[PDB]
Amino acid sequence: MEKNFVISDPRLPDNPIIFASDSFLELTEYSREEILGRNCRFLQGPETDQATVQKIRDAIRDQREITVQLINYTKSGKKFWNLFHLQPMRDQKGELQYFIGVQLDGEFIPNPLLGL
Ligand SMILES: Cc1cc2nc3c(=O)[nH]c(=O)nc-3n(C[C@H](O)[C@H](O)[C@H](O)COP(=O)(O)O)c2cc1C
């Protein structure tokens, strides 16, 4: 199965990407070397809804799963709608270890309804 995903380590400064799937490289047009150690916010740009970014920030703070649809940008500046799902990953002792973030590319929710 095709799997667009990244794993971050929230126990390192500003939650850097420590793994990015081949399909994530293909979707975003970035190389692995350009992604590893970055916060995944680099995909955001002018058209990204800051209210949606806020919902992600709160979900990371509270270590809760969330799904949002937001505008992201490829390396070459191509806009794409990202249906983005965040999942906290805890160790055997219930301590946060990682976040996994899975991307689906497409305007799943029409922008007229998303804007409501
Ligand atoms: C595992 C993981 C994957 C993420 N993937 C994306 C993504 O694909 N697109 C995006 O805009 N933000 C993504 N983020 C969110 C940003 O990294 C950041 O948490 C968000 O923009 C809110 O924080 P900020 O307000 O400090 O930027 C991801 C976060 C995590 C932990």
PDB file of N, CA and C in Angstrom, residues 8-81:
ATOM      1  N   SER A   8       8.152  12.109  13.765  1.00  0.00           N
ATOM      2  CA  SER A   8       8.915  13.159  14.478  1.00  0.00           C
ATOM      3  C   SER A   8       9.316  12.636  15.852  1.00  0.00           C
ATOM      4  N   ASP A   9      10.369  13.215  16.415  1.00  0.00           N
ATOM      5  CA  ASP A   9      10.803  12.901  17.792  1.00  0.00           C
ATOM      6  C   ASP A   9      10.556  14.132  18.657  1.00  0.00           C
ATOM      7  N   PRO A  10       9.441  14.185  19.416  1.00  0.00           N
ATOM      8  CA  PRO A  10       9.134  15.357  20.244  1.00  0.00           C
ATOM      9  C   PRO A  10      10.078  15.518  21.446  1.00  0.00           C
ATOM     10  N   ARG A  11      10.995  14.571  21.655  1.00  0.00           N
ATOM     11  CA  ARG A  11      12.030  14.654  22.722  1.00  0.00           C
ATOM     12  C   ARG A  11      13.307  15.300  22.177  1.00  0.00           C
ATOM     13  N   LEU A  12      13.294  15.761  20.928  1.00  0.00           N
ATOM     14  CA  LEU A  12      14.371  16.608  20.364  1.00  0.00           C
ATOM     15  C   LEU A  12      13.793  17.982  20.058  1.00  0.00           C
ATOM     16  N   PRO A  13      14.641  19.030  20.021  1.00  0.00           N
ATOM     17  CA  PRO A  13      14.159  20.397  19.854  1.00  0.00           C
ATOM     18  C   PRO A  13      13.253  20.582  18.633  1.00  0.00           C
ATOM     19  N   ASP A  14      12.076  21.156  18.888  1.00  0.00           N
ATOM     20  CA  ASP A  14      11.064  21.553  17.874  1.00  0.00           C
ATOM     21  C   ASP A  14      10.646  20.349  17.023  1.00  0.00           C
ATOM     22  N   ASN A  15      10.575  19.161  17.624  1.00  0.00           N
ATOM     23  CA  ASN A  15       9.821  18.014  17.067  1.00  0.00           C
ATOM     24  C   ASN A  15      10.307  17.700  15.651  1.00  0.00           C
ATOM     25  N   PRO A  16      11.605  17.389  15.440  1.00  0.00           N
ATOM     26  CA  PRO A  16      12.133  17.184  14.094  1.00  0.00           C
ATOM     27  C   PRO A  16      11.679  15.862  13.461  1.00  0.00           C
ATOM     28  N   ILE A  17      11.616  15.839  12.131  1.00  0.00           N
ATOM     29  CA  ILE A  17      11.314  14.609  11.346  1.00  0.00           C
ATOM     30  C   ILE A  17      12.546  13.707  11.424  1.00  0.00           C
ATOM     31  N   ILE A  18      12.375  12.466  11.878  1.00  0.00           N
ATOM     32  CA  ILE A  18      13.487  11.471  11.985  1.00  0.00           C
ATOM     33  C   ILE A  18      13.279  10.367  10.943  1.00  0.00           C
ATOM     34  N   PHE A  19      12.091  10.305  10.347  1.00  0.00           N
ATOM     35  CA  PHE A  19      11.781   9.365   9.239  1.00  0.00           C
ATOM     36  C   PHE A  19      10.770  10.010   8.293  1.00  0.00           C
ATOM     37  N   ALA A  20      10.981   9.869   6.983  1.00  0.00           N
ATOM     38  CA  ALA A  20      10.029  10.298   5.938  1.00  0.00           C
ATOM     39  C   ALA A  20       9.939   9.192   4.889  1.00  0.00           C
ATOM     40  N   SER A  21       8.719   8.782   4.551  1.00  0.00           N
ATOM     41  CA  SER A  21       8.438   7.688   3.587  1.00  0.00           C
ATOM     42  C   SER A  21       8.796   8.162   2.177  1.00  0.00           C
ATOM     43  N   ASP A  22       9.141   7.216   1.306  1.00  0.00           N
ATOM     44  CA  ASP A  22       9.412   7.473  -0.131  1.00  0.00           C
ATOM     45  C   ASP A  22       8.271   8.295  -0.741  1.00  0.00           C
ATOM     46  N   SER A  23       7.014   7.939  -0.465  1.00  0.00           N
ATOM     47  CA  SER A  23       5.810   8.606  -1.027  1.00  0.00           C
ATOM     48  C   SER A  23       5.736  10.057  -0.535  1.00  0.00           C
ATOM     49  N   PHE A  24       6.135  10.324   0.713  1.00  0.00           N
ATOM     50  CA  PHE A  24       6.232  11.705   1.249  1.00  0.00           C
ATOM     51  C   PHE A  24       7.265  12.498   0.436  1.00  0.00           C
ATOM     52  N   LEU A  25       8.441  11.918   0.163  1.00  0.00           N
ATOM     53  CA  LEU A  25       9.484  12.562  -0.687  1.00  0.00           C
ATOM     54  C   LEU A  25       8.863  12.909  -2.047  1.00  0.00           C
ATOM     55  N   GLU A  26       8.151  11.947  -2.645  1.00  0.00           N
ATOM     56  CA  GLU A  26       7.542  12.088  -3.996  1.00  0.00           C
ATOM     57  C   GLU A  26       6.479  13.191  -3.979  1.00  0.00           C
ATOM     58  N   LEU A  27       5.584  13.172  -2.988  1.00  0.00           N
ATOM     59  CA  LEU A  27       4.479  14.164  -2.867  1.00  0.00           C
ATOM     60  C   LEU A  27       5.060  15.577  -2.753  1.00  0.00           C
ATOM     61  N   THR A  28       6.072  15.761  -1.902  1.00  0.00           N
ATOM     62  CA  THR A  28       6.561  17.104  -1.499  1.00  0.00           C
ATOM     63  C   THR A  28       7.681  17.579  -2.434  1.00  0.00           C
ATOM     64  N   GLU A  29       8.300  16.665  -3.199  1.00  0.00           N
ATOM     65  CA  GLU A  29       9.438  16.923  -4.130  1.00  0.00           C
ATOM     66  C   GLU A  29      10.737  17.230  -3.372  1.00  0.00           C
ATOM     67  N   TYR A  30      10.753  17.111  -2.043  1.00  0.00           N
ATOM     68  CA  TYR A  30      11.981  17.285  -1.233  1.00  0.00           C
ATOM     69  C   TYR A  30      12.732  15.951  -1.209  1.00  0.00           C
ATOM     70  N   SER A  31      14.056  16.016  -1.131  1.00  0.00           N
ATOM     71  CA  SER A  31      14.919  14.834  -0.874  1.00  0.00           C
ATOM     72  C   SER A  31      14.892  14.507   0.623  1.00  0.00           C
ATOM     73  N   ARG A  32      15.255  13.279   0.989  1.00  0.00           N
ATOM     74  CA  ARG A  32      15.339  12.853   2.411  1.00  0.00           C
ATOM     75  C   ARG A  32      16.290  13.804   3.149  1.00  0.00           C
ATOM     76  N   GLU A  33      17.410  14.169   2.514  1.00  0.00           N
ATOM     77  CA  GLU A  33      18.470  15.021   3.117  1.00  0.00           C
ATOM     78  C   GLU A  33      17.894  16.397   3.480  1.00  0.00           C
ATOM     79  N   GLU A  34      16.893  16.874   2.731  1.00  0.00           N
ATOM     80  CA  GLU A  34      16.252  18.204   2.919  1.00  0.00           C
ATOM     81  C   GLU A  34      15.156  18.151   3.986  1.00  0.00           C
ATOM     82  N   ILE A  35      14.708  16.956   4.372  1.00  0.00           N
ATOM     83  CA  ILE A  35      13.546  16.771   5.290  1.00  0.00           C
ATOM     84  C   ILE A  35      14.058  16.411   6.684  1.00  0.00           C
ATOM     85  N   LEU A  36      14.990  15.458   6.786  1.00  0.00           N
ATOM     86  CA  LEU A  36      15.404  14.897   8.099  1.00  0.00           C
ATOM     87  C   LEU A  36      15.923  16.027   8.995  1.00  0.00           C
ATOM     88  N   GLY A  37      15.374  16.115  10.204  1.00  0.00           N
ATOM     89  CA  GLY A  37      15.801  17.080  11.231  1.00  0.00           C
ATOM     90  C   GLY A  37      15.019  18.385  11.188  1.00  0.00           C
ATOM     91  N   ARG A  38      14.077  18.516  10.250  1.00  0.00           N
ATOM     92  CA  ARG A  38      13.200  19.708  10.096  1.00  0.00           C
ATOM     93  C   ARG A  38      11.880  19.491  10.829  1.00  0.00           C
ATOM     94  N   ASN A  39      11.280  20.576  11.311  1.00  0.00           N
ATOM     95  CA  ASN A  39       9.858  20.561  11.726  1.00  0.00           C
ATOM     96  C   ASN A  39       9.027  20.549  10.438  1.00  0.00           C
ATOM     97  N   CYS A  40       7.953  19.761  10.392  1.00  0.00           N
ATOM     98  CA  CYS A  40       7.144  19.547   9.163  1.00  0.00           C
ATOM     99  C   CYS A  40       6.372  20.818   8.771  1.00  0.00           C
ATOM    100  N   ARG A  41       6.427  21.887   9.577  1.00  0.00           N
ATOM    101  CA  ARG A  41       5.776  23.187   9.230  1.00  0.00           C
ATOM    102  C   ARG A  41       6.393  23.817   7.967  1.00  0.00           C
ATOM    103  N   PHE A  42       7.593  23.403   7.540  1.00  0.00           N
ATOM    104  CA  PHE A  42       8.237  23.926   6.301  1.00  0.00           C
ATOM    105  C   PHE A  42       7.321  23.731   5.085  1.00  0.00           C
ATOM    106  N   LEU A  43       6.378  22.780   5.128  1.00  0.00           N
ATOM    107  CA  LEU A  43       5.423  22.538   4.016  1.00  0.00           C
ATOM    108  C   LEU A  43       4.362  23.641   3.951  1.00  0.00           C
ATOM    109  N   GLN A  44       4.225  24.449   4.993  1.00  0.00           N
ATOM    110  CA  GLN A  44       3.184  25.500   5.027  1.00  0.00           C
ATOM    111  C   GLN A  44       3.692  26.720   4.261  1.00  0.00           C
ATOM    112  N   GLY A  45       2.760  27.596   3.916  1.00  0.00           N
ATOM    113  CA  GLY A  45       3.053  28.806   3.144  1.00  0.00           C
ATOM    114  C   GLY A  45       1.914  29.800   3.286  1.00  0.00           C
ATOM    115  N   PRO A  46       1.943  30.875   2.476  1.00  0.00           N
ATOM    116  CA  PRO A  46       1.001  31.987   2.618  1.00  0.00           C
ATOM    117  C   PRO A  46      -0.481  31.592   2.718  1.00  0.00           C
ATOM    118  N   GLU A  47      -0.908  30.593   1.943  1.00  0.00           N
ATOM    119  CA  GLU A  47      -2.337  30.205   1.806  1.00  0.00           C
ATOM    120  C   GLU A  47      -2.742  29.252   2.931  1.00  0.00           C
ATOM    121  N   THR A  48      -1.793  28.742   3.721  1.00  0.00           N
ATOM    122  CA  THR A  48      -2.102  27.837   4.860  1.00  0.00           C
ATOM    123  C   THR A  48      -2.943  28.571   5.909  1.00  0.00           C
ATOM    124  N   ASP A  49      -4.109  28.023   6.247  1.00  0.00           N
ATOM    125  CA  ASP A  49      -5.030  28.591   7.260  1.00  0.00           C
ATOM    126  C   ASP A  49      -4.373  28.509   8.640  1.00  0.00           C
ATOM    127  N   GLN A  50      -4.076  29.656   9.251  1.00  0.00           N
ATOM    128  CA  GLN A  50      -3.376  29.723  10.563  1.00  0.00           C
ATOM    129  C   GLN A  50      -4.271  29.147  11.667  1.00  0.00           C
ATOM    130  N   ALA A  51      -5.599  29.194  11.509  1.00  0.00           N
ATOM    131  CA  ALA A  51      -6.553  28.605  12.475  1.00  0.00           C
ATOM    132  C   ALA A  51      -6.357  27.082  12.513  1.00  0.00           C
ATOM    133  N   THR A  52      -6.102  26.464  11.363  1.00  0.00           N
ATOM    134  CA  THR A  52      -5.877  25.000  11.260  1.00  0.00           C
ATOM    135  C   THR A  52      -4.526  24.660  11.903  1.00  0.00           C
ATOM    136  N   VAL A  53      -3.485  25.439  11.597  1.00  0.00           N
ATOM    137  CA  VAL A  53      -2.135  25.289  12.222  1.00  0.00           C
ATOM    138  C   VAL A  53      -2.306  25.323  13.748  1.00  0.00           C
ATOM    139  N   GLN A  54      -3.130  26.234  14.261  1.00  0.00           N
ATOM    140  CA  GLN A  54      -3.417  26.352  15.715  1.00  0.00           C
ATOM    141  C   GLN A  54      -3.996  25.033  16.246  1.00  0.00           C
ATOM    142  N   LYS A  55      -4.952  24.433  15.536  1.00  0.00           N
ATOM    143  CA  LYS A  55      -5.588  23.159  15.957  1.00  0.00           C
ATOM    144  C   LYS A  55      -4.518  22.066  16.055  1.00  0.00           C
ATOM    145  N   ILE A  56      -3.578  22.028  15.113  1.00  0.00           N
ATOM    146  CA  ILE A  56      -2.460  21.040  15.150  1.00  0.00           C
ATOM    147  C   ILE A  56      -1.594  21.321  16.381  1.00  0.00           C
ATOM    148  N   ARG A  57      -1.229  22.582  16.610  1.00  0.00           N
ATOM    149  CA  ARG A  57      -0.349  22.986  17.742  1.00  0.00           C
ATOM    150  C   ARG A  57      -0.958  22.507  19.064  1.00  0.00           C
ATOM    151  N   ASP A  58      -2.256  22.754  19.252  1.00  0.00           N
ATOM    152  CA  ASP A  58      -3.007  22.349  20.471  1.00  0.00           C
ATOM    153  C   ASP A  58      -3.004  20.823  20.601  1.00  0.00           C
ATOM    154  N   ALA A  59      -3.170  20.097  19.488  1.00  0.00           N
ATOM    155  CA  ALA A  59      -3.252  18.618  19.494  1.00  0.00           C
ATOM    156  C   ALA A  59      -1.892  18.053  19.911  1.00  0.00           C
ATOM    157  N   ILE A  60      -0.808  18.669  19.445  1.00  0.00           N
ATOM    158  CA  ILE A  60       0.576  18.256  19.817  1.00  0.00           C
ATOM    159  C   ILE A  60       0.795  18.571  21.302  1.00  0.00           C
ATOM    160  N   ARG A  61       0.355  19.747  21.762  1.00  0.00           N
ATOM    161  CA  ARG A  61       0.472  20.151  23.189  1.00  0.00           C
ATOM    162  C   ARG A  61      -0.192  19.091  24.072  1.00  0.00           C
ATOM    163  N   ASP A  62      -1.417  18.704  23.726  1.00  0.00           N
ATOM    164  CA  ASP A  62      -2.259  17.784  24.538  1.00  0.00           C
ATOM    165  C   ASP A  62      -1.986  16.332  24.148  1.00  0.00           C
ATOM    166  N   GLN A  63      -1.129  16.114  23.147  1.00  0.00           N
ATOM    167  CA  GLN A  63      -0.707  14.772  22.672  1.00  0.00           C
ATOM    168  C   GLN A  63      -1.975  13.982  22.323  1.00  0.00           C
ATOM    169  N   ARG A  64      -2.860  14.594  21.534  1.00  0.00           N
ATOM    170  CA  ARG A  64      -4.139  13.991  21.092  1.00  0.00           C
ATOM    171  C   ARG A  64      -4.074  13.764  19.582  1.00  0.00           C
ATOM    172  N   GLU A  65      -4.759  12.741  19.089  1.00  0.00           N
ATOM    173  CA  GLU A  65      -4.837  12.530  17.628  1.00  0.00           C
ATOM    174  C   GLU A  65      -5.727  13.642  17.060  1.00  0.00           C
ATOM    175  N   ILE A  66      -5.446  14.056  15.832  1.00  0.00           N
ATOM    176  CA  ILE A  66      -6.270  15.054  15.102  1.00  0.00           C
ATOM    177  C   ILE A  66      -6.175  14.742  13.611  1.00  0.00           C
ATOM    178  N   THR A  67      -7.233  15.074  12.877  1.00  0.00           N
ATOM    179  CA  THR A  67      -7.236  15.131  11.399  1.00  0.00           C
ATOM    180  C   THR A  67      -7.677  16.532  10.988  1.00  0.00           C
ATOM    181  N   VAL A  68      -6.907  17.165  10.108  1.00  0.00           N
ATOM    182  CA  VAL A  68      -7.227  18.504   9.538  1.00  0.00           C
ATOM    183  C   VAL A  68      -6.882  18.455   8.056  1.00  0.00           C
ATOM    184  N   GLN A  69      -7.486  19.343   7.282  1.00  0.00           N
ATOM    185  CA  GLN A  69      -7.151  19.539   5.856  1.00  0.00           C
ATOM    186  C   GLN A  69      -6.540  20.928   5.738  1.00  0.00           C
ATOM    187  N   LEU A  70      -5.322  21.030   5.217  1.00  0.00           N
ATOM    188  CA  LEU A  70      -4.683  22.362   5.087  1.00  0.00           C
ATOM    189  C   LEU A  70      -3.844  22.404   3.815  1.00  0.00           C
ATOM    190  N   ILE A  71      -3.604  23.620   3.340  1.00  0.00           N
ATOM    191  CA  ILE A  71      -2.777  23.887   2.131  1.00  0.00           C
ATOM    192  C   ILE A  71      -1.307  23.671   2.505  1.00  0.00           C
ATOM    193  N   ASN A  72      -0.607  22.867   1.720  1.00  0.00           N
ATOM    194  CA  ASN A  72       0.861  22.695   1.811  1.00  0.00           C
ATOM    195  C   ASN A  72       1.449  23.024   0.435  1.00  0.00           C
ATOM    196  N   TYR A  73       2.773  23.107   0.369  1.00  0.00           N
ATOM    197  CA  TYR A  73       3.535  23.508  -0.836  1.00  0.00           C
ATOM    198  C   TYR A  73       4.646  22.492  -1.077  1.00  0.00           C
ATOM    199  N   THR A  74       4.819  22.072  -2.328  1.00  0.00           N
ATOM    200  CA  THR A  74       5.963  21.239  -2.764  1.00  0.00           C
ATOM    201  C   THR A  74       7.204  22.129  -2.834  1.00  0.00           C
ATOM    202  N   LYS A  75       8.376  21.523  -2.986  1.00  0.00           N
ATOM    203  CA  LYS A  75       9.654  22.268  -3.116  1.00  0.00           C
ATOM    204  C   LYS A  75       9.529  23.318  -4.234  1.00  0.00           C
ATOM    205  N   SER A  76       8.869  22.979  -5.343  1.00  0.00           N
ATOM    206  CA  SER A  76       8.755  23.860  -6.541  1.00  0.00           C
ATOM    207  C   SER A  76       7.615  24.868  -6.367  1.00  0.00           C
ATOM    208  N   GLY A  77       6.983  24.914  -5.191  1.00  0.00           N
ATOM    209  CA  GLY A  77       5.947  25.902  -4.844  1.00  0.00           C
ATOM    210  C   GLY A  77       4.552  25.508  -5.308  1.00  0.00           C
ATOM    211  N   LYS A  78       4.328  24.256  -5.715  1.00  0.00           N
ATOM    212  CA  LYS A  78       2.976  23.774  -6.097  1.00  0.00           C
ATOM    213  C   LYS A  78       2.133  23.611  -4.828  1.00  0.00           C
ATOM    214  N   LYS A  79       0.963  24.251  -4.773  1.00  0.00           N
ATOM    215  CA  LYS A  79      -0.002  24.082  -3.655  1.00  0.00           C
ATOM    216  C   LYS A  79      -0.694  22.721  -3.786  1.00  0.00           C
ATOM    217  N   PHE A  80      -0.903  22.031  -2.665  1.00  0.00           N
ATOM    218  CA  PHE A  80      -1.758  20.824  -2.594  1.00  0.00           C
ATOM    219  C   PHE A  80      -2.498  20.853  -1.262  1.00  0.00           C
ATOM    220  N   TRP A  81      -3.751  20.413  -1.283  1.00  0.00           N
ATOM    221  CA  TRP A  81      -4.538  20.156  -0.057  1.00  0.00           C
ATOM    222  C   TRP A  81      -3.987  18.876   0.566  1.00  0.00           C
TER     223      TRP A  81
END
